Amino acid sequence: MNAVEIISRDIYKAIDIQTKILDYMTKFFTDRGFKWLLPIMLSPITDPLRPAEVDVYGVRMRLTHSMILHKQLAIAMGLEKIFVLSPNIRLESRRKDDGRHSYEFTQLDFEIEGAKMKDVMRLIEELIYGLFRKAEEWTGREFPRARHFKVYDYKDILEEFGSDEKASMEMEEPFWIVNIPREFYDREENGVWKNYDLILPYGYGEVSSGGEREWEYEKIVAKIRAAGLKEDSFRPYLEIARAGKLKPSAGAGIGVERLVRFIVGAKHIAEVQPFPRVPGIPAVI
Amino acid sequence: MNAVEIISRDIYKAIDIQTKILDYMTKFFTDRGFKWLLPIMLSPITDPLWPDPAGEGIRPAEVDVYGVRMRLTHSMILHKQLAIAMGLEKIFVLSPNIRLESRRKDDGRHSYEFTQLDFEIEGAKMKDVMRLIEELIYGLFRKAEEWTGREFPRARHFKVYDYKDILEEFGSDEKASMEMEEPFWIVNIPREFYDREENGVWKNYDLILPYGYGEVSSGGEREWEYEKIVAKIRAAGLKEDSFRPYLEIARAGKLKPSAGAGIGVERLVRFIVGAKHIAEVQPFPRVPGIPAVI
Ligand SMILES: Nc1ncnc2c1ncn2[C@@H]1O[C@H](COP(=O)(O)O)[C@@H](O)[C@H]1O
Ligand SMILES: Nc1ncnc2c1ncn2[C@@H]1O[C@H](COP(=O)(O)O)[C@@H](O)[C@H]1O
Ligand SMILES: NC(=O)C[C@H](N)C(=O)O
Ligand SMILES: NC(=O)C[C@H](N)C(=O)O
């Protein structure tokens, strides 16, 4: 699509839904006493998940992969409960152009001081359930009805369906995948990862991801080294961890476009974006 | 300052005010039928921010995306016009901007990363947008008195001054701001190609806060005609090459008359808490000319 074709698409309904979704979600969090933060796009540190880079007054800065580390820093500042509509940049290859990836997207990213994994899962369930009932009033269609979703261990997913891909295809209710070996910020205890991904049914895939966090220096540094990452990619973060100023917390990020896609029923996520950002295809506009 | 000093700052109060402000402003627009758009951070094209009396002529940060040069968002002005061209009628976005300005703009009012609530309205005129902004601001200030217990400017409408008369009378909008005790409008400012110009009159407006706090909002009616637009780009010595896909859309006759504005969120928060320096309202300061540690 050239520039003129991009702007000649019909996208009014998807944007209408998006507006209702953003209004609903931001209110859900402010009603529960969350502080509303603004995002940052450039920092010496970002989610390790190679991040694009740019020089800023002579210093190399990474474009934000995600704000996970900054959420932990906000908790360390004593903000208690925070969320942000955070734009992310993730330059995946043509292979990830599967209808559910975009190389620029926003997540509603939130964190809570002292929360446990079941608290956050329950909180997301409350949000999704309320939202699905509204989506029925908005679009005169029917959505998944469960108040709580089934919980699968990552290994049970691999065993029964082979992949989270096949899992999503087979299901008709959202479902959780838990205990997923991941990054250094996710808390691991007794070989169990205290983390969680909410998966949508009908092949739509992941919509939310989160976990309890590591806050202890030695444990964090061990997992970084263990993964073969350079500790100096996280220097200022590790200095706050060393000062013992990280606090226990838990949170998650919700993919806004993925949620909008599900509620509108769009085949490709590009259809709900006024300016598509398709993996492997540099945007025309 | 260093990481531990930053996280040690006390800014709970500013963030609490910010939360109430964001809640208030987004509701203001959704209540009025505006569509809520998500931001874009990377694009082949962005706001030149030039000509502009308020700028020094910075170049956008750039990064390759699949081998192709992309500019980090200076502002979403061109994208706002494209949204109007897609028929969305009334739109807003909480748009982050990256503007790598020099130490000379570290005046307490600038940060090199910030968010503006950026909005646009098909068919609107400058008086319409200015009146909408006054409505938003008046109502915000009334709520702020309850949130803070302090008093705020009570004006329901603000006085209007020509840019040219500001320069002759005060010497600068900075000095004008120091002398005023209520918000005020400065209009008719020769600047970027996208603001509408008719017979030497620019159909644009800046809202200036009192007490030296300076500009908090900027907007204008827009150009939509290809030939008019291209002529202005050429006369400023900018390159058509820098706006290629946008000019394609203009050439096809698909831009529509519209007007809008951007409102500085952090600048507004700073005003309401009475912060000396905008960095005091940001969990992660972005001081012009100084690379942030986090
Ligand atoms: N529109 C999106 N494009 C790419 N990644 C996304 C998008 N929305 C959310 N994500 C993130 O993608 C990750 C999941 O990877 P994947 O299994 O490939 O779906 C999570 O960290 C999500 O936060
Ligand atoms: N460097 C900055 N730091 C904080 N806010 C800014 C900055 N630049 C612009 N703004 C805000 O964004 C609005 C629109 O941007 P602009 O018209 O480009 O100057 C301004 O009226 C300010 O409220
Ligand atoms: N990159 C991610 O998806 C991380 C996720 N938002 C979290 O809070 O853990
Ligand atoms: N200069 C800018 O940031 C553009 C402004 N947001 C407008 O609507 O005119």
Ligand SMILES: [Mg+2]
């Ligand atoms: Mg301005």
